Write an enzyme that holds these catalytic residues in place. Structure first.
Site, mmCIF file in Angstrom:
data_model
loop_
_atom_site.group_PDB
_atom_site.id
_atom_site.type_symbol
_atom_site.label_atom_id
_atom_site.label_comp_id
_atom_site.label_asym_id
_atom_site.label_seq_id
_atom_site.Cartn_x
_atom_site.Cartn_y
_atom_site.Cartn_z
ATOM 1 N N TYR A 1 6.752 -10.914 -3.175
ATOM 2 C CA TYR A 1 6.927 -11.969 -4.159
ATOM 3 C C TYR A 1 8.353 -12.118 -4.694
ATOM 4 O O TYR A 1 8.593 -12.080 -5.892
ATOM 5 C CB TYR A 1 5.961 -11.770 -5.301
ATOM 6 C CG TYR A 1 4.553 -12.132 -4.958
ATOM 7 C CD1 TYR A 1 3.634 -11.173 -4.689
ATOM 8 C CD2 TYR A 1 4.142 -13.438 -4.935
ATOM 9 C CE1 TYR A 1 2.347 -11.499 -4.400
ATOM 10 C CE2 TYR A 1 2.853 -13.772 -4.647
ATOM 11 C CZ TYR A 1 1.958 -12.797 -4.377
ATOM 12 O OH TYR A 1 0.660 -13.129 -4.087
ATOM 13 N N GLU B 1 -12.005 15.005 6.329
ATOM 14 C CA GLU B 1 -11.848 13.586 6.287
ATOM 15 C C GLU B 1 -12.815 12.908 5.367
ATOM 16 O O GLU B 1 -12.474 11.890 4.810
ATOM 17 C CB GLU B 1 -11.929 12.992 7.676
ATOM 18 C CG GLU B 1 -11.846 11.485 7.723
ATOM 19 C CD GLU B 1 -13.206 10.847 7.893
ATOM 20 O OE1 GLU B 1 -14.199 11.610 7.878
ATOM 21 O OE2 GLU B 1 -13.284 9.597 8.048
ATOM 22 N N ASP C 1 -15.680 13.588 12.787
ATOM 23 C CA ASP C 1 -16.869 13.277 13.596
ATOM 24 C C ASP C 1 -16.698 13.406 15.122
ATOM 25 O O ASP C 1 -15.593 13.381 15.637
ATOM 26 C CB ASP C 1 -17.363 11.862 13.260
ATOM 27 C CG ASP C 1 -17.999 11.773 11.874
ATOM 28 O OD1 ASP C 1 -19.092 12.357 11.691
ATOM 29 O OD2 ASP C 1 -17.411 11.113 10.980
#
Ligand SMILES: C[C@@H]1C[C@H]2O[C@@H]2/C=C\C=C\C(=O)Cc2c(Cl)c(O)cc(O)c2C(=O)O1
Ligand SMILES: C[C@@H]1C[C@H]2O[C@@H]2/C=C\C=C\C(=O)Cc2c(Cl)c(O)cc(O)c2C(=O)O1
EC number: 5.6.2.2
Lengths: 347, 506, 347, 506
Positions: free
Chosen positions: A76, A172, A224
């Site tokens: 901005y 995690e 995982d």
């Protein structure tokens, strides 16, 4: 009353102002971008310039002016002046654009955003036998109730004092962290236990490779079965989607394919039964990702490969929860310790 | 003789095409009766329809030219000219029967006379005629001959001939004559009034009338048996062979000539009137072979002009660019020739897939057979990309003029040029010498657009890096506006490294 | 050496074991679900039962066995036995299913997961003049370096001691929080400054309405112009996507429409210029959401309505960053203070 | 007389339909020559094609029935019967011309005789005939009459008639005769051999032959002028009016009768042969009015049977359920009648959107005009949801039998029943009395499937809540397996609250 902080707010300016300054009105100059020069006297390149030498000064000014700028706060400043030319366009149009201009500067200088003070947007808890001074306090990381300290997006002005551990363990899933924590892992086996929260942020990183680098602490991490989990890891030994301040030689700790199936050499951790129903079968949109990574120049290197296709081969994955649903006692005083001392992991 | 049963050969195949012919025969002539004697011509062309049942028309041309010496009126219209007496100065007009054929076609299908009027330069009165012809024994019969008073300073030649044709079939093709003649001859003023009642006026756009063509002595390499004979029996005194070989041809000085007599093997001081049939030939041989003469001088020729061209095709196509070129004169079979060329581009010219080709032989347009032309070849053969042209469709026009006293025509009078090699090459190059003027202008178009492309963008970019780079200097909020400008203009000038311009755009 | 913790691990069992126990082998019983009884002797309802009285015991056992269960850890008890009937089906098939069975129990008992100890997955920082004991430590929330304490997914066993502030300020963007924080807002205007991180979690909540309820502290919160921002708010005064432990009468503090455009009564906060380029124009997929909420029974009530259609009307929104890019000084010692004392907000 | 120009009225409109007729005329008769005299019938039906050009066939029926007393052969086939002599015991067979019409149609279009054979019960030899007819004066001409030896214990009647028809047009409709006759008559054994060479054999499935019908004295309320006369001139002695009103009609005892003589106003001891035309009527009036008689006894009737029905439509549809019903006999216009009814459901019956309706009048199928039937109404009018049926498409069959000595037919011999109210109501109820049975079996089907639905699911759910609820008891890992079972079976029994069963499924 600011200190090691008013350190940088100086080494910033002076070792910067000088580098971007070129003026030298003898002959027409340019910047040098080592990863490719950018001549202001081009066409395709002309605009690319005013963009760098802007988003730069915006930094340098907000820099001496004791502000703390966030990357968007900086986006901005698109359109900075009234119109001088009545074309009867914008400085930059999409954040993506502005960002790149950063990264470019970021190189020209040698200084990473966080060092120029542009403070960004970080998460990622930590907890352990560790004592730091941050800013004006020293806060002890053991004495933390059930909570946990959350690093500051400027993790480079942060001094170590007393340490007490032998390995850092990066988990995690926030949910499992809360579990390892309220048993006491990090105290039983002296360690520091920290979680990211999924995709590792830009400076939950820096912290880590600083532990590993300045304190000589070995780093094991776990997620995982899936190709997802292999990714988290990837980021941790480089930095999201292809500087040299992310840690290589981190360590992958499970959950391993053989973790669920075994080898003729080494016993499996999953009952034949539980397995039929905890394993979530592999969608084919998954087997893609795998075959994409199995190719990355830093998997290709190792017999990391082995544990890829074994998956490409059994089409199967499980969630870390599943394993922990066996019940902390196991996850606490079996899985980790066993694996760790056992040298069961990849490197 | 021949035109009686074999009409189509000299250009009168059928009713319609004949109209067109007669028209381009009268203009052809009327010009050569003005612009060659140095007057700004004012031709008027009116065709009328006087009988519907039989389809009869009345072609009419009225000039301000010189006109015929009265007594030679009959021996111009009635007498049938065998041959085209070898040419010695450029003229308009194909065959050797020309305007005569028109009157002949007129007495074959209709029963009305040929109204004629003339009045020489600085003339007393206006001599009027009204002629018909006797076809069997070649001799014109005068129906009427008289004279009235001249309303001062008048001179002209009014010809009025009636023929049967087909206006609608040949309309769109006649209009092309006038138009296209207008272009390369803008020192003229034309008016045309068709049988319907449509008037057209094309106005004189200047008056730089070119140099006219000069008559000149025959050239050796291009003459044979037939001619030599008539040069001889056309004499007045007793020339010897010497004089005769020198004072009668282009290119033959004292020493230059003597050696021709060594070849043909002839005595030098011999009476001319005493030459056998064979002696002659033994000469015309050595003529044909002798190696080094000079060039067939081109003072007998006449040119449009590297400018009347420009103007001509500017004041009618209104393009975004024009250019022309007149070559130095080359030489062909004992005769000289020059090729002129021009092109116009853009602006008003119609956007189409292929270029327009205007053909010009001896200051006259050629309309029919553009497809079998030595020119239509070159300009379709030419690779228009090696010269700028990027686009599929484009607006280009091309003008190629060819003139000589010996124009090689391809077939039995079929309005197109023959593939004489040595000619075809000077026709090529000529197009190239324009075509590469086209690439130039269209190389300075990308240039002119390239400046306003940069110099525009920069005016936007040198204030910004200006301010930015100034903030870096003094950190304190005072120099902001001082360092600013003392390098804005500093910057600005470092730009006149490439291109120089002072520009204010508001 | 556990304390106020071995509190609950007791009030849990006994005031539970009893409620789920029904046995009473006189006549055939059922559970009562007030938000509707569930007769084990039905058909459609038969399976719905064994599911509750399972996912329940699983809780009660893991409860006395000193475990700390996460919701998924619990889902992974689908299929609990060997097959007794050779149908020549599963207990539960999709986490969604298991969850509902929770919520049901959750009512039957009166105890919220977090009170049964099922610890979930709790992220949301906090910082301020506040002192708590958590577990076995007292950690002071002022003395925190640039970091910040992160609550524990069990925020109900957490004692207050000394407080020092007059309002709690809940900010949605982590990045801006790091800004308000490294200037010192919460100290200048004595307050407690906490951020969620986007969608507010299930217990960064509980903390808030406990501040508001037990300490009598008024709660102002701020986010983006959009219908997105109105949502965050929504959650905060009830609980994500339609118990009574989320705070009503919280306060909305900007960024307001008039914040960007004004009223004939009251001056606007951005320049006319900045607006043309900071405002991101409204896509029509947005104007939907708005018209959906403008209908929610707890917006319909107020002249909250006013500030809805004004947007439905100017099709325009801006990001909080935008505003802050005006530069902390303004965001710090103008925006908040001005608005707050000014009574510029909604209630 | 009449059938000569108005054929279609008695059922012989055209070649084809006539074949069908003749066939159902011969069977009709052949049965009534066996099952009414108490023998298990063995009918054989063969149709042959003996000429292709003219389309001529040979219908042939062979039974094991009684047969004709020899001398009455001609007066059975050749003689044309005016009327249908008022009926007094149930029979098969519409009009009063029956089998006679067949032979009459045979002598109108073809020129071959009518081969006949008979041999009475306990007969000596086999009497053979071969008859033709004289049509003008009503009397049969014998072409051939003879007799051979009987190979013991044989009795039967072989009729062979030739007619012109159209086999293919009426094939699929004849086959329906045999088939549907078989159903309600399973005490028989049929064989049919079509002109092509297709054999069909339907075998006797039992031998419970029903009670036959009994002839019986005329009933008062249903007789008039015409009859009374012929009862009188058909006598043998001098009855008085008294005797005559009692020993000649159903329902007329000593005191019951005397009062009729009070009405019609007649002397009681008067000779019968002495009755004027008017006296009679004054009687037939009081007949029509007298209030309380008894019911027209139904010992003249005959029924299928609440079982032969069942069997019949079981051994051919093979459903999942069957049921039938035979009503008590009601009364209509001096005559008795009964309605039988049945339905079959599921199994092999074809799934379709609407039920199949088999119509039966006097032990014979009705095929044509099912659409204009008093029955086709009721069974389409009936609301099949108020009786179980949930689905759109379903497999139901419906059998409705109607029998009396006075069957009301709707139109001029068009094979369907008339809408006599008092009848229609006993036809309704009868259906209801089955329909609320079919509903029964199909209410115990949802029941039987509802148990195995629950009792199955529970066996899966009572171990789980069992274990679970046990863990809650003892926290220590010892009672786990003890508390378990002592409430597993505890639970299990609390289930025999609703339904009782001990089941092991393995
Ligand atoms: C004597 C002049 C000038 C001659 O040099 C011109 C060459 C050829 C002219 C041939 C003619 O037949 C005469 C003639 C014709 Cl036909 C005509 O249609 C119009 C004219 O103006 C003249 C004419 O005036 O001829
Ligand atoms: C005397 C027997 C038995 C009678 O009771 C049966 C009732 C009516 C029969 C009427 C007849 O015309 C005789 C007859 C015909 Cl027509 C026929 O086609 C086949 C037959 O077998 C008999 C027959 O044998 O009649």
């Amino acid at each position: 009353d600011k200190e090691a902080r008013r350190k940088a707010a100086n080494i910033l300016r002076d070792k910067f102002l000088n580098l971007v300054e070129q003026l030298k009105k003898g002959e027409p100059l340019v910047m040098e971008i080592p990863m490719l020069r950018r001549n202001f006297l081009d066409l395709n390149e002309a605009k690319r310039f005013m963009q760098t030498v802007l988003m730069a000064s915006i930094i340098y000014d907000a820099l001496v002016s004791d502000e703390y700028p966030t990357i968007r706060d900086l986006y901005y400043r698109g359109k900075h002046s009234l119109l001088l030319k009545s074309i009867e366009e914008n400085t930059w149009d999409e954040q993506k654009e502005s960002d790149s201009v950063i990264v470019d500067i970021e190189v020209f200088t040698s200084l990473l955003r966080e060092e120029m003070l542009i403070l960004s947007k970080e998460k990622g808890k930590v907890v352990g036998n560790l004592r730091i001074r941050s800013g004006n306090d020293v806060i002890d990381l053991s004495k933390t109730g059930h909570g946990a300290y959350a690093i500051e997006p400027t993790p480079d002005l942060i001094d170590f004092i007393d340490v007490d551990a032998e390995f850092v363990l990066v988990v995690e899933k926030d949910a499992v962290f809360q579990q390892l924590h309220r048993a006491g892992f990090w105290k039983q086996y002296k360690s520091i236990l920290i979680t990211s929260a999924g995709q590792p942020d830009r400076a939950t990183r820096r912290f880590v490779r600083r532990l590993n680098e300045e304190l000589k602490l070995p780093v094991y991490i776990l997620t995982d079965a899936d190709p997802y989990g292999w990714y988290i890891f990837s980021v941790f030994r480089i930095g999201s989607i292809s500087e040299r301040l992310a840690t290589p030689d981190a360590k992958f700790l499970g959950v391993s394919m053989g973790d669920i199936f075994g080898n003729s050499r080494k016993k499996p951790y999953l009952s034949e039964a539980e397995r039929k129903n905890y394993i979530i079968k592999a969608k084919d949109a998954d087997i893609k990702r795998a075959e994409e990574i199995k190719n990355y120049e830093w998997f290709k290197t190792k017999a990391w490969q082995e544990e890829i296709n074994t998956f490409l081969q059994r089409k199967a994955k499980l969630e870390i929860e599943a394993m922990a649903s066996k019940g902390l006692k196991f996850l606490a005083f079996q899985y980790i310790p066993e694996k760790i001392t056992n040298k069961d992991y990849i490197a | 003789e021949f035109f009686k049963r074999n009409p189509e050969l000299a250009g009168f195949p059928n009713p319609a095409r004949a109209l067109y012919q007669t028209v381009r025969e009268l203009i052809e002539n009327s010009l050569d009766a003005t612009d060659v004697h140095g007057i700004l011509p004012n031709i008027k062309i009116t065709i009328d329809l006087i009988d519907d049942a039989r389809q009869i028309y009345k072609v009419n041309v009225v000039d301000n030219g010189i006109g015929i010496p009265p007594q030679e009126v009959p021996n111009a219209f009635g007498r049938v000219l065998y041959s085209s007496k070898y040419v010695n100065r450029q003229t308009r007009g194909m065959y050797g029967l020309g305007v005569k054929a028109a009157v002949l076609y007129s007495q074959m299908h209709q029963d009305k006379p040929i109204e004629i009027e003339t009045s020489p330069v600085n003339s007393k009165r206006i001599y009027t005629f009204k002629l018909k012809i006797d076809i069997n024994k070649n001799e014109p019969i005068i129906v009427e001959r008289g004279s009235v008073e001249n309303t001062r300073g008048f001179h002209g030649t009014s010809v009025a001939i009636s023929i049967p044709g087909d206006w609608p079939k040949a309309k769109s093709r006649i209009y092309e004559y006038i138009k296209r003649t207008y272009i390369i001859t803008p020192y003229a003023e034309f008016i045309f009034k068709d049988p319907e009642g449509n008037v057209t006026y094309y106005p004189r756009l200047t008056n730089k009338i070119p140099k006219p063509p000069q008559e000149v002595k025959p050239h050796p390499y291009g003459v044979d048996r037939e001619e030599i004979k008539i040069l001889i029996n056309n004499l007045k005194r007793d020339y010897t062979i010497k004089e005769f070989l020198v004072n009668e041809f282009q290119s033959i000085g004292d020493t230059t000539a003597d050696k021709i007599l060594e070849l043909a093997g002839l005595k030098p001081n011999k009476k001319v009137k005493n030459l056998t049939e064979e002696e002659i030939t033994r000469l015309v041989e050595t003529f044909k072979k002798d190696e080094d003469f000079r060039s067939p001088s081109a003072d007998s020729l006449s040119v449009i002009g590297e400018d009347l061209i420009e103007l001509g095709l500017k004041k009618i196509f209104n393009p975004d660019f024009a250019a022309s070129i007149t070559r130095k004169p080359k030489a062909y079979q004992g005769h000289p020739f020059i090729v002129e060329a021009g092109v116009a581009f853009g602006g008003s010219i119609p956007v189409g897939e292929e270029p327009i080709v205007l053909r010009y032989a001896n200051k006259i347009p050629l309309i029919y057979d553009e497809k079998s032309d030595v020119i239509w070849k070159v300009v379709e053969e030419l690779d228009w990309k090696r010269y700028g042209i990027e686009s599929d469709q484009y607006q280009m026009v091309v003008m190629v003029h060819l003139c000589s006293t010996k124009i090689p025509y391809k077939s039995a009078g079929k309005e197109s040029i023959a593939e004489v090699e040595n000619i075809e090459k000077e026709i090529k190059n000529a197009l190239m010498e324009v075509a590469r003027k086209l690439k130039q202008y269209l190389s300075e178009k990308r240039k002119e657009q390239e400046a306003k492309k940069k110099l525009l963008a920069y005016l936007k970019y040198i204030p910004e890096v200006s301010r930015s780079l100034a903030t870096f200097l003094a950190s304190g909020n005072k120099e902001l506006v001082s360092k600013y400008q003392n390098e804005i203009s500093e910057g600005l000038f470092k730009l006149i490294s490439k291109k120089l311009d002072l520009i204010n755009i508001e």
